[PDB]
Paper text:
To create the ligand‐binding pocket, we first designed a mutant Fr‐F1 (Fr‐R59F) in which Arg59 was replaced by Phe59. Analysis of the 2Fo‐Fc maps revealed electron densities corresponding to Nile Red (NR) at the two‐fold symmetric interfaces of NR•Fr‐F1, NR•Fr‐F2, NR•Fr‐F4, and NR•Fr‐F6, observed as overlapping densities due to the interface symmetry. NR was positioned between two F59 residues, forming π–π stacking interactions in an F59–NR–F59' configuration. Anion‐π interactions between NR and E60 in NR•Fr‐F1 and NR•Fr‐F2, and CH‐π interactions between NR and F60 in NR•Fr‐F6, were identified, indicating NR's stabilization in the F59–F59' pocket via multiple non‐covalent interactions. Notably, NR•Fr‐F1 and NR•Fr‐F2, containing only one and two Phe residues, respectively, achieve higher quantum yields (94 and 95%, respectively) and longer lifetimes (5.54 and 5.75 ns, respectively) than NR•Fr‐F6 with six Phe residues per monomer. The hydrophobic and polar nature of the protein surface around NR influences its fluorescence properties, with the partially polar microenvironment in Fr‐F1 and Fr‐F2, attributed to Glu residues near the pocket entrance, potentially enhancing fluorescence. The quantum yield of Nile Red (NR) significantly increased from 0.50 in 100% methanol (MeOH) and 0.38 in a 50% MeOH‐water mixture to 0.88–0.95 upon encapsulation within Fr‐F1, Fr‐F2, Fr‐F4, and Fr‐F6. Furthermore, NR's fluorescence lifetime extended from 2.87 ns in organic solvent and 1.26 ns in aqueous‐organic mixture to 5.23–5.75 ns within these ferritin variants.
As a scaffold for aromatic cluster design, we chose ferritin as a protein cage platform with a 12 nm outer diameter and an 8 nm inner cavity, composed of 24 subunits. To prove this concept through protein engineering, we focused on a two‐fold symmetric inter‐subunit interface of a recombinant horse spleen apo‐L ferritin (Fr) as a target region for mutagenesis. Herein, we present the construction of an aromatic cluster with an artificial molecular binding pocket at the two‐fold symmetric interface of ferritin and explore its ligand‐binding characteristics. We developed a system that uses ligand binding as a driving force to induce and propagate changes in the orientation of multiple aromatic side chains.
Author numbering:
A (entry chain A), B (entry chain A), C (entry chain A), D (entry chain A), E (entry chain A): 1 to 173
The structure:
């Protein structure tokens, strides 16, 4: 409320609510990816666990945004959450490509919100994103690119063999 | 590569590579300073250890820049490393003055890169420098100024005595 | 200085300084190899760690030479450090071949310095090299040859698969 | 005796006995230096302890030579031990200069014996000296030069003050 | 000697000495196999360790036979030990086939000695072989057959890949 709100624009408040939607959508996408890889006809446990972990990380991101919204005196507003873009996610390669596309979209939304904060002279917002989101996103995208490269190297002329080996020797934990 | 690169300009990529060169040059300068103070005709162990520690710190700085370059999708490019500016470093006072000059040069390069990042709207770069370099540099320059002042107070009319006492009671560990 | 210098020729002093340059050049080469393998489009962690460890080992070698130079009363003299021979290092096989070529060059330089020491009747120098460098180099070259052979056996008709398996089952730690 | 003696020349046997004499003479010199610094009118405990420790180290050196003589089948032969060159040793500076002169003399004797062993193709003798004497001597001479330099820096225009400070802050343990 | 010898035929005594020769020959064969796999151009550590362990096991077998010979009052007689049948041992498959051939030969020699003992009514000899040799040999031959089958399954159309995988996932310890 207005009792604590200071230097917190309506534009930033709304963009924060939009970003919560994007993180919860991303969490939902990762839930769908994770359970696809748990199908008996897909059966790649390491890939399932990778994406289920990302579902939790994205929910945590939304939670942190909602805590900050209240710390600043803004009001959380929730919208409908769109279902994921696919019901079936193809190979590990297809899935990891979809995830990197998703992560770049979230990263661009973080950068856009940082730029709005900078324009509005809101350094608390800018520090919040830098401290809890920007480097986390850069680290995750780098990890996913490393994975993509290893998955791509393993396709060669024996795709099933490569897909099994990647799950067993890189992801399974 | 382009598979992960996002909001990372060619200008920042090149300046990062330049800054790696400056840190490795600084590491090399500190290696030369450290071993000069280990000469049998100089023999100031605390001063030697001070500069050898700084050689390692500057290498670590270069390492962190190289990790970040890859996290962002840029490409490390290495250049020849210039030898240090002196083969003999004079007194502890002369050496500490040279080190503060070196550190101010690195600090200015950090500030210049921060300003480029700000101009290019690259908040990850700006946060990286603020979080791992700017305050570390400020702390080190303050330490070195404190040392300079103590060394200068000890010169008086008995320079050898002062140089021994500083090494024994401030630096030796 | 002359206050401690005994049985230490100008020829050995200069060759020691040259060898410090070669070790620091080798360290720099291994830094470049290590970070190449950390690229998102290469992504072979075990190979990166192998070469980063070698960067540190070669720096340690230079450090030991510089300590001995001072123990003997010689004077360390530093020269410019040439950049590595390549900016991109190809496959793990290409890189391991380059490393063995580098190591044989360092080994020949050690042998040449040993021979100079023997000719100058400098047994301290000869023992120093035998005790801290010759067997270390032989052990490392044997390791690298073992690696080369395993990498070569894995190329067959599925190079990407072999390169992944070598990194995962031999190098990753 | 001849029952075990193999590749052990009469020349090396005699030079070993001569070297035992030199080490025991050096031990005796250090005993005299140590007790001089324990005089009530000299009273520099750290300097006394430094030289008493060196008396023990030199005796240990003689002991090791005598063990090796018997291991090789040679026969220990003892000669009269000359008294030290001085009854009073002057300042800490005078004493440290005398000690470095003594150590260089022992080092030259080690080098001469190494050269005889090399000429006689006696690698056990050569390794023995390299492993237990040459580097120990180099390390000690470097230490003594470092001390000389610090003592010399402290003389300035207040010699008593410098002599006290060196004993208290470098040697006293 | 005759002071303890009881129910111990000259035929069994001689066959025991022959069997010691066969075990020491087998130990020597396994030493050669082990070091072949340690060559830089073969480089299969698990295979090397497998055969070096077998060298020790076969020596232990000879030792046990020699202890028993003396327990029974027979006299150990040693003969020349023939060098192994090959200087180079080919692939892991070739080597494992040679080892199974060697083990079947030792097993037949054990069975022949058991039969001689049975014919001579020497139950101590028969129990000795049953208790310390027959089942050990059966277990080892079964292990080696299991290995052969796995090596053979891995040849397919990528022999190098299979040879690496067997060493890494079955033998390396
Ligand atoms: C002279 C410029 N160069 C050559 C590129 C240096 C200088 C200093 C270095 N210091 C280290 C170092 C220091 C402490 C602990 C670990 C390490 C290490 O693993 C690698 C190093 O590499 C170095 C290279
Ligand atoms: C032959 C006459 N000389 C030379 C003056 C000896 C003889 C025996 C010595 N034994 C020791 C000794 C023995 C045990 C533990 C410590 C020490 C030591 O610190 C110094 C010694 O100094 C010696 C000199
Ligand atoms: Cl939808
Ligand atoms: Cl230059
Ligand atoms: Cl160059
Ligand atoms: Cl005399
Ligand atoms: Cl034969």
């Amino acid at each position: 409320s207005s009792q604590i709100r200071q230097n917190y624009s309506t534009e930033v408040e709304a963009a924060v609510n939009r970003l919560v939607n994007l993180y919860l959508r991303a969490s939902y996408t990762y839930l769908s990816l994770g359970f696809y890889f748990d199908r008996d006809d897909v059966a790649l446990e390491g890939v399932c666990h990778f994406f289920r972990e990302l579902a939790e990380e994205k929910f945590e991101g939304a939670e942190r945004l909602l805590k900050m919204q209240n710390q600043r005196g803004g009001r959380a507003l929730f919208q409908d959450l769109q279902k994921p873009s696919q019901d079936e996610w193809g190979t590990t390669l297809d899935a990891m490509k979809a995830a990197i596309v998703l992560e770049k979209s979230l990263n661009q939304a973080l950068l856009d919100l940082h730029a709005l904060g900078s324009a509005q002279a809101d350094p608390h917002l800018c520090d919040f994103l830098e401290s809890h989101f920007l480097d986390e996103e850069v680290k995750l995208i780098k990890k996913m690119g490393d994975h993509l490269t290893n998955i791509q190297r393993l396709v060669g002329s024996q795709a099933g063999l490569g897909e099994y080996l990647f799950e067993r020797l890189t992801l399974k934990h």
